[PDB]
Amino acid sequence: DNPKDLEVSDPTETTLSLRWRRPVAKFDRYRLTYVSPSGKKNEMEIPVDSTSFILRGLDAGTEYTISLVAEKGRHKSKPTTIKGSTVVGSPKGISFSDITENSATVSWTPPRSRVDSYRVSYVPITGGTPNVVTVDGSKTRTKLVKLVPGVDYNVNIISVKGFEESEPISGILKT
Secondary structure, eight states: OOOEEEEEESOOSSEEEEEEEOOSSOOSEEEEEEEOTTOOEEEEEEOTTOSEEEEESOOTTOEEEEEEEEESSSOBOOOEEEEEEOOOOOOSOEEEESOOSSOEEEEEOOOSSOOSEEEEEEEETTOOOOEEEEEETTOOEEEEOSOOSSOEEEEEEEEEETTEEOOOEEEEEEO
16 A cells, blocks of 8 residues: 655745655555656655655755655555655845945845846835835846935845745845
8 A cells, every 4th residue: 555645835945845644554664765857866764653744955946756655564565756846045145235315236145046037125114015126037136226215124035937936035224
């Protein structure tokens, strides 16, 4: 009897949350293998008492073929397979420079993940509707204009690849 309903939840940049149904048959343990697009196969043995396990140490915005199997002794059951891709990576550090009464140069350090663009949003701490500016993936910085003098600005930056958009990083910008 093989593990049924293997599903992946809560995609992270480096993790995937796995959940499945336990086998009706008596068994030893589980063996989880997952290979990357390069064909790198990783194994792990999971306790008979688990129906959930957080997969970790993965790369960002990468798809994985995940397969679970119940090892009954020396007999591995029929493999249960699914695919799960990690979410695209977040930029690593937001920094501000060339501040002024009306403009600032926000810059960020690029992630180790293929990226098409970045969505830089900014709004004053007191609230309002964001002002989003898109900039090409090769670019690592941008200029903000029309900035009101003396006011703290919440500035978020998000990576985008295809339709996938990572977790944002943010910083306060003081005009």
